[PDB]
Design a protein around this motif. Structure first.
Motif, PDB file in Angstrom:
ATOM      1  N   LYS A 259       0.827  -1.200   0.000  1.00 44.97           N
ATOM      2  CA  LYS A 259       0.000   0.000   0.000  1.00 44.97           C
ATOM      3  C   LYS A 259       0.866   1.256   0.000  1.00 44.97           C
ATOM      4  O   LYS A 259       0.351   2.374   0.006  1.00 44.97           O
ATOM      5  CB  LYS A 259      -0.926   0.007   1.219  1.00 44.97           C
ATOM      6  N   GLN A 260       2.181   1.064  -0.009  1.00 40.72           N
ATOM      7  CA  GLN A 260       3.116   2.182  -0.012  1.00 40.72           C
ATOM      8  C   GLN A 260       3.361   2.684  -1.431  1.00 40.72           C
ATOM      9  O   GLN A 260       2.737   2.213  -2.382  1.00 40.72           O
ATOM     10  CB  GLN A 260       4.441   1.768   0.631  1.00 40.72           C
ATOM     11  N   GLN A 261       4.273   3.641  -1.566  1.00 41.51           N
ATOM     12  CA  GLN A 261       4.600   4.206  -2.871  1.00 41.51           C
ATOM     13  C   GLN A 261       4.518   3.144  -3.961  1.00 41.51           C
ATOM     14  O   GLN A 261       4.172   3.438  -5.105  1.00 41.51           O
ATOM     15  CB  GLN A 261       5.999   4.824  -2.846  1.00 41.51           C
ATOM     16  N   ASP A 262       4.839   1.906  -3.599  1.00 46.40           N
ATOM     17  CA  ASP A 262       4.802   0.798  -4.546  1.00 46.40           C
ATOM     18  C   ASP A 262       3.670   0.981  -5.552  1.00 46.40           C
ATOM     19  O   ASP A 262       3.894   0.971  -6.762  1.00 46.40           O
ATOM     20  CB  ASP A 262       4.633  -0.529  -3.805  1.00 46.40           C
ATOM     21  N   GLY A 263       2.453   1.150  -5.043  1.00 46.49           N
ATOM     22  CA  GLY A 263       1.305   1.332  -5.911  1.00 46.49           C
ATOM     23  C   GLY A 263       0.073   0.609  -5.402  1.00 46.49           C
ATOM     24  O   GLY A 263      -0.332   0.793  -4.255  1.00 46.49           O
ATOM     25  N   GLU A 264      -0.523  -0.214  -6.258  1.00 50.81           N
ATOM     26  CA  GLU A 264      -1.718  -0.965  -5.889  1.00 50.81           C
ATOM     27  C   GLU A 264      -1.712  -2.348  -6.536  1.00 50.81           C
ATOM     28  O   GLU A 264      -0.911  -2.626  -7.428  1.00 50.81           O
ATOM     29  CB  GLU A 264      -2.976  -0.202  -6.304  1.00 50.81           C
ATOM     30  N   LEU A 265      -2.612  -3.212  -6.077  1.00 51.53           N
ATOM     31  CA  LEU A 265      -2.713  -4.567  -6.610  1.00 51.53           C
ATOM     32  C   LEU A 265      -3.793  -4.651  -7.682  1.00 51.53           C
ATOM     33  O   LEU A 265      -4.933  -4.236  -7.466  1.00 51.53           O
ATOM     34  CB  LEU A 265      -3.016  -5.557  -5.484  1.00 51.53           C
ATOM     35  N   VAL A 266      -3.430  -5.193  -8.840  1.00 50.78           N
ATOM     36  CA  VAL A 266      -4.369  -5.337  -9.946  1.00 50.78           C
ATOM     37  C   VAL A 266      -4.799  -6.789 -10.117  1.00 50.78           C
ATOM     38  O   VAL A 266      -5.867  -7.071 -10.660  1.00 50.78           O
ATOM     39  CB  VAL A 266      -3.760  -4.833 -11.268  1.00 50.78           C
ATOM     40  N   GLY A 267      -3.960  -7.709  -9.648  1.00 56.02           N
ATOM     41  CA  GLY A 267      -4.271  -9.121  -9.760  1.00 56.02           C
ATOM     42  C   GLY A 267      -3.241  -9.997  -9.075  1.00 56.02           C
ATOM     43  O   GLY A 267      -2.306  -9.496  -8.452  1.00 56.02           O
ATOM     44  N   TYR A 268      -3.413 -11.310  -9.189  1.00 52.77           N
ATOM     45  CA  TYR A 268      -2.493 -12.258  -8.572  1.00 52.77           C
ATOM     46  C   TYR A 268      -1.913 -13.211  -9.613  1.00 52.77           C
ATOM     47  O   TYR A 268      -2.292 -13.173 -10.784  1.00 52.77           O
ATOM     48  CB  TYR A 268      -3.205 -13.053  -7.477  1.00 52.77           C
ATOM     49  N   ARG A 269      -0.992 -14.063  -9.177  1.00 56.90           N
ATOM     50  CA  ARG A 269      -0.358 -15.025 -10.071  1.00 56.90           C
ATOM     51  C   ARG A 269      -0.266 -16.400  -9.412  1.00 56.90           C
ATOM     52  O   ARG A 269       0.491 -16.593  -8.461  1.00 56.90           O
ATOM     53  CB  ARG A 269       1.039 -14.543 -10.467  1.00 56.90           C
ATOM     54  N   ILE A 270      -1.042 -17.349  -9.926  1.00 51.87           N
ATOM     55  CA  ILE A 270      -1.046 -18.703  -9.388  1.00 51.87           C
ATOM     56  C   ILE A 270      -0.370 -19.677 -10.346  1.00 51.87           C
ATOM     57  O   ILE A 270      -0.673 -19.702 -11.539  1.00 51.87           O
ATOM     58  CB  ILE A 270      -2.480 -19.191  -9.106  1.00 51.87           C
TER      59      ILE A 270
ATOM     60  N   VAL B  15       1.631 -25.843  -5.396  1.00 50.24           N
ATOM     61  CA  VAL B  15       0.890 -24.600  -5.580  1.00 50.24           C
ATOM     62  C   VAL B  15       1.721 -23.398  -5.146  1.00 50.24           C
ATOM     63  O   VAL B  15       2.506 -23.480  -4.201  1.00 50.24           O
ATOM     64  CB  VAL B  15      -0.430 -24.611  -4.788  1.00 50.24           C
ATOM     65  N   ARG B  16       1.541 -22.280  -5.843  1.00 48.69           N
ATOM     66  CA  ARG B  16       2.275 -21.059  -5.530  1.00 48.69           C
ATOM     67  C   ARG B  16       1.525 -19.830  -6.038  1.00 48.69           C
ATOM     68  O   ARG B  16       1.142 -19.764  -7.207  1.00 48.69           O
ATOM     69  CB  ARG B  16       3.674 -21.107  -6.147  1.00 48.69           C
ATOM     70  N   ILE B  17       1.320 -18.861  -5.153  1.00 54.14           N
ATOM     71  CA  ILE B  17       0.618 -17.635  -5.511  1.00 54.14           C
ATOM     72  C   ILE B  17       1.517 -16.416  -5.337  1.00 54.14           C
ATOM     73  O   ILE B  17       2.372 -16.384  -4.452  1.00 54.14           O
ATOM     74  CB  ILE B  17      -0.654 -17.447  -4.665  1.00 54.14           C
ATOM     75  N   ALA B  18       1.314 -15.412  -6.184  1.00 55.32           N
ATOM     76  CA  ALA B  18       2.104 -14.187  -6.120  1.00 55.32           C
ATOM     77  C   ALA B  18       1.240 -12.962  -6.402  1.00 55.32           C
ATOM     78  O   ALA B  18       0.191 -13.064  -7.037  1.00 55.32           O
ATOM     79  CB  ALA B  18       3.264 -14.255  -7.102  1.00 55.32           C
ATOM     80  N   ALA B  19       1.689 -11.806  -5.926  1.00 59.75           N
ATOM     81  CA  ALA B  19       0.958 -10.561  -6.129  1.00 59.75           C
ATOM     82  C   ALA B  19       1.354  -9.901  -7.444  1.00 59.75           C
ATOM     83  O   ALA B  19       2.532  -9.858  -7.801  1.00 59.75           O
ATOM     84  CB  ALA B  19       1.199  -9.612  -4.965  1.00 59.75           C
ATOM     85  N   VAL B  20       0.362  -9.385  -8.164  1.00 59.24           N
ATOM     86  CA  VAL B  20       0.608  -8.725  -9.441  1.00 59.24           C
ATOM     87  C   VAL B  20       0.104  -7.286  -9.422  1.00 59.24           C
ATOM     88  O   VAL B  20      -1.004  -7.010  -8.959  1.00 59.24           O
ATOM     89  CB  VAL B  20      -0.069  -9.479 -10.601  1.00 59.24           C
ATOM     90  N   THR B  21       0.925  -6.370  -9.929  1.00 55.39           N
ATOM     91  CA  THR B  21       0.563  -4.959  -9.970  1.00 55.39           C
ATOM     92  C   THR B  21       0.709  -4.395 -11.378  1.00 55.39           C
ATOM     93  O   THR B  21       1.025  -5.123 -12.320  1.00 55.39           O
ATOM     94  CB  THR B  21       1.428  -4.130  -9.004  1.00 55.39           C
ATOM     95  N   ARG B  22       0.478  -3.094 -11.516  1.00 53.70           N
ATOM     96  CA  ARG B  22       0.584  -2.432 -12.811  1.00 53.70           C
ATOM     97  C   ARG B  22       2.044  -2.301 -13.236  1.00 53.70           C
ATOM     98  O   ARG B  22       2.343  -1.784 -14.312  1.00 53.70           O
ATOM     99  CB  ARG B  22      -0.068  -1.049 -12.755  1.00 53.70           C
TER     100      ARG B  22
END
Length: 124
Positions: free
Chosen positions: A46-57, A94-101
């Motif tokens: 939620k920091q300068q990084d930006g925002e979450l648009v989706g995930y990666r499984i 199984v493996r999940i990851a966070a995806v952003t813009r």
């Protein structure tokens, strides 16, 4: 383009990506249903990084003599994923990851799930 007319390296980024994975990462394997329940939590991104648009499984199936690989695509509006047992009696990770813009963050801890064969009585 001399007899090539190939792509063109357009503007590219230099930095900015979710250097974190999803929390509450849990994976359930229904024995009665040929489906895999997947539920995780949103990262503190939620920091300068930006925002979450989706995930990666990423779920790969590794069996004796048979090795297959699968890849699911889920967006921000989901917080839930499901996979139809593609292989039985095999070890799937199984493996999940966070995806952003910006890009795709690192996948979470690898979860080795044991896929029980169709049916096998007289086991215990």
């Amino acid at each position: 383009g001399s007899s090539g007319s190939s792509g063109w390296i357009l503007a590219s980024t230099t930095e900015g990506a979710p250097s974190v994975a999803p929390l509450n990462v849990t994976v359930f394997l229904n024995e009665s249903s040929d489906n895999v329940d997947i539920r995780w939590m949103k990262p503190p991104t939620k920091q300068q990084d930006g925002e979450l648009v989706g995930y990666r499984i990423s779920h790969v199936w590794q069996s004796a003599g048979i090795s297959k690989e699968l890849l699911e695509e889920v967006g921000q509006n989901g917080s839930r994923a499901r996979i139809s047992v593609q292989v039985h009696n095999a070890t799937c990770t199984v493996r999940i990851a966070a995806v952003t813009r910006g890009g795709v963050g690192p996948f979470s801890d690898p979860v080795k799930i044991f896929i029980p064969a169709h049916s096998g009585p007289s086991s215990g």
